[PDB]
From a paper:
Bile salt hydrolases (BSHs) comprise a diverse family of microbial enzymes that catalyse critical BA transformation.
To examine the molecular foundations of BSH substrate specificity, we determined the crystal structures of six of the Lactobacillaceae BSHs examined above: four glycine-preferring (LgasBSHb, LaciBSHa, LingBSH, LreuBSH) and two taurine-preferring (LgasBSHa, LjohBSHc) BSHs.
Residue numbers in the entry:
A (entry chain D), B (entry chain A), D (entry chain B): 2 to 325
C (entry chain C): 2 to 326
Write the structure that this text describes.
Amino acid sequence: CTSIIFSPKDHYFGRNLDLEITFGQQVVITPRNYTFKFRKMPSLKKHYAMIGISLDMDDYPLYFDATNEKGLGMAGLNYPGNATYYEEKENKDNIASFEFIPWILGQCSTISEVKDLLSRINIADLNFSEKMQASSLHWLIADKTGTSLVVETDKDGMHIYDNPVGCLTNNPQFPKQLFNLNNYADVSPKMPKNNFSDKVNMAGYSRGLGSHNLPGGMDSESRFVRVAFNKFNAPIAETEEENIDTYFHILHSVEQQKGLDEVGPNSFEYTIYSDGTNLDKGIFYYTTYSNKQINVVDMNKEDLDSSNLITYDMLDKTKFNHQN
Amino acid sequence: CTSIIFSPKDHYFGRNLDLEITFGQQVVITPRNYTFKFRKMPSLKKHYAMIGISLDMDDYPLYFDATNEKGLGMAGLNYPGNATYYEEKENKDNIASFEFIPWILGQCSTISEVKDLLSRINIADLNFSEKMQASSLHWLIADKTGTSLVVETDKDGMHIYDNPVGCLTNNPQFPKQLFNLNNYADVSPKMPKNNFSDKVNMAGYSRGLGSHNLPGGMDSESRFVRVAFNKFNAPIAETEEENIDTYFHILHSVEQQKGLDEVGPNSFEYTIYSDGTNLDKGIFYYTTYSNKQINVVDMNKEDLDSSNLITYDMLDKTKFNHQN
Amino acid sequence: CTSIIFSPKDHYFGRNLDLEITFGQQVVITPRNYTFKFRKMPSLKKHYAMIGISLDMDDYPLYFDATNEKGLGMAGLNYPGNATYYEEKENKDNIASFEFIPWILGQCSTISEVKDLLSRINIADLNFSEKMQASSLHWLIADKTGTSLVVETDKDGMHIYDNPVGCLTNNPQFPKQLFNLNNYADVSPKMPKNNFSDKVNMAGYSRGLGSHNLPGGMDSESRFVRVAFNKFNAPIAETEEENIDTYFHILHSVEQQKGLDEVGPNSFEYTIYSDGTNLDKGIFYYTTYSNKQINVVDMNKEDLDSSNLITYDMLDKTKFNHQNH
Amino acid sequence: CTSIIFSPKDHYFGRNLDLEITFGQQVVITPRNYTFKFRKMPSLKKHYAMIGISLDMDDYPLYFDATNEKGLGMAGLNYPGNATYYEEKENKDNIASFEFIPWILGQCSTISEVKDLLSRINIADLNFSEKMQASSLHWLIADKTGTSLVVETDKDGMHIYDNPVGCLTNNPQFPKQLFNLNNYADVSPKMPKNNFSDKVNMAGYSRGLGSHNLPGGMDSESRFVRVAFNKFNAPIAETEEENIDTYFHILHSVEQQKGLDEVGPNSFEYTIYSDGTNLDKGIFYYTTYSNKQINVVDMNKEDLDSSNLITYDMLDKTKFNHQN
């Protein structure tokens, strides 16, 4: 998985979901008066409305990532082997990992409010069902000022980090992931100087040689570096159409192509989908692996005061434009 | 530029066109009875029909790449500084670089016929006009057996190479480009073995670590290695829709994103378009940088006995699908 | 800087010193009854003898690294910008960075005893003098069982790490440095399998292609990975001569060559020297940049009950052997 | 194997010999009136004196590398699978690959003289003895002007190349080996500039980060790049002691450590010795894997008009200096 906030003019937040199998995701809008039930907290009977990609299990939205009507966004990305969910604490809001996105996006409008709410939270070891055991996740949270932060629940407790580069992938823990970027200071959009020796003729035989050491791999660290390079060198435009086009080139640059990340016999982790929300306008965009026409769901064209889930199918089939 | 042949069941040939500035291009079917004129050879009054993308002129089809009705495909890719075109030779067929595709694709059906014609050819230093100086190219040729061939006109003469990997980018010369692949034997879709030492605990901390050393750069050798890894590990499917989807994932895996390959002040080489032809069926497909919905032009739906160029606009503007 | 413990049979501990300027340093044995004086603690009037390379100033051994007579070793490696030394603390033993090696090596014989002393230490922001401001260092400590730990004094306090690979270089902090090794699991002494695709003919055109992605750089992470690869694939022998021979190949594999690491105009960081001590025997070995004949100083041939520093020159000029004479 | 000419003031030519088995080589001075016998040419009864490392096979010097009294040096380096030796030719001096060094260094004093002799040569497929096949080699040749050239005998003929970097290792052919240097222009002794993006704070956390991408491997291409970086950034001094010290630091920077290049079960290729000769002065220097004190043999202190080989044992055992 890869998640970014991209702030050329308006602010766009979203992620690639990298898994080996698709099973029942939809675009889900949760309106303000849908009651969020919590295992160990009183229900949120009214809350901010939100939109994202989710499973719908027994009428409950298990969000992979979402954005609320105040321009606050949040995404849960795989964090295998690192994620720890804790015992219940008598002095904290005990919130399950699968309840984390509704808890936060339903109650908070800014990063500062997120931090305040997190000062009272305990991400607790609670499973949705015996069938659906909890996934191992860490979270990227960003708001429409362009500020972002990272939440990791490690063995020695929960850690919260300001995110100066506004990107997140998977393992390792954010301090190591962020520091690894320092090793790529010389990766450049421009041709290199001959620093090797002026007594040797270095021929600039290919445009693009500046990025010769850009990681191309499917792994977590390679995608973090690659998405950071793409994000901070992408062009800035004035229109919505241009900036969302650029946004999807950023995420598609770290797409996991089928066959390249093999996790088992004929089993391949790949980018199921790419989404992005205009945090300033509440507009949800997505592409899928097989359908890279941009699909648009406008949260503001729904009745956000209603009390039941609003669902749209993810258009995940190849759609061709036949010019005859 | 990157060009491949991809042979899952049917055979698909095409390329990314990477340039820092466009002047327009278009899809062009040249029918059988469009007379091909040649500066130094008699005209081909009748020939095979072909389809590809050319410059936005209707004087003459100046193809970037094309595929004829017999399943033979050919693409010219930037070869900066290496490409040498020769003085006219009395005992050869003197053919301009911009006449190469019509000359070959107009008369040849197989790689074997291509080689016979190439043995008597001389790629002459002729310009389409005094203003339109010939660009520096080398060529990938492939037919529907999956066999392919590289043509390079260097300063010491024309060299013709069998291509065992069916890929081509830009510099250097093909023996160096092909040999460089030997350095990436251990790049893997599966998790790496701990070869370092069984006394060191190596944590397989991220899926995709097998490809940690896959090159991600925008440069010529990086894209050659990366597209070969993508092509030979791409899944094999049974439907046309699935295999052409896969084909565009291979080409998009070596797309040059705007901003990442700087050739001058605010001037960036980027992937203008990606195209692919089903050599077996005569069906032409393309995406462009800003419109990655796949566009289809079926050559067999046209009057191939016509005498006039048949043209279609390249739809290069972002197409959104609004769902609510 | 690069420091290792190498444990083929006996145990060998030491380091490359990577700096841009030398002058002053000697092989220095501090005997049992040389009185170690401390700015904020009572003097150690008698203590374990030790041997190492030191800058002697005002009759005080400013050790770069040393090993004591009980087979405990300790080295201070550059930690630029990372090292933080603290205000004096009540309820702690306040010890200056330049007194750290005498404090530990004078009093401890084992890692377990080192850990006891560290639980009550505080590395204080104290300078040798106005002209000698304290260096930014972190420390590798190893004993003759082959166990080692790392001490790093960061902005948010002192951290002590068990060291499973027995190697240290410079920045970054040890958890990041140790975790970076995970990126090199596929580096191999053996020819690589063709994982790329069995549809592509990968020619095995050179021996050694298994190590094609081994880092060769002069930088701290590169050297950490390269020294670990060298150490864990080095052969093990049953002889002192062979095992110390191997030891210096490990250290020399990560030598910084003059001209390859420029830290300012006409100023280059390079490996001044490599040393190694046999912890089980008390034998100090070293080479220098211009003299890679192994020089030997046996601490046990000196009077370890004396009270004065005992010094030997670092033989740092090239000594050619004319076979033709 | 790695071979260089290093030209700080005087000129130093030599090599690392990288093999898995030591045989029993020694330092051999061949005086002017030792008769060189050839299988298919008249004997060379008087010739230039030379010094180098040789096997000894009943009175015949089989040099790995040598340098003659006129300052011409030559080294045979493994070229596995690539070396082709030819059928005898009726119009050429047919010289065995193991006769090549005596043939050249016996009669030539300069690179230009070498090039004239090579115009009449045919490196023929002659083995030294029934159960000792010829080894597969290519050669680096250099003289006291600093100039060097490469001789490679490939399937399609002998190829001679001027060597602009004065370096050679093993496979592949020299054109590909040399061109690969272009991929390392940015490898630097100096700290890198932040070209990734100035919106990203890149910490220059370690001295030497400029060489972060210097290859460290044991393989042929890695050592070629690494010895070149070491050679052209090595300091230049006024005296012999200083320059020969620098010279061995260059060769030792590409030493293959035991255990790092496994060629078979419990069998490793390693640097058996490093040697260099002062071309201007005829002084021979060497280290061995286990003895890094520089050993010196002055060819000119011997009787160069003699008729018998003059042999010295290689001091290959560790010799310690006990200071107390």
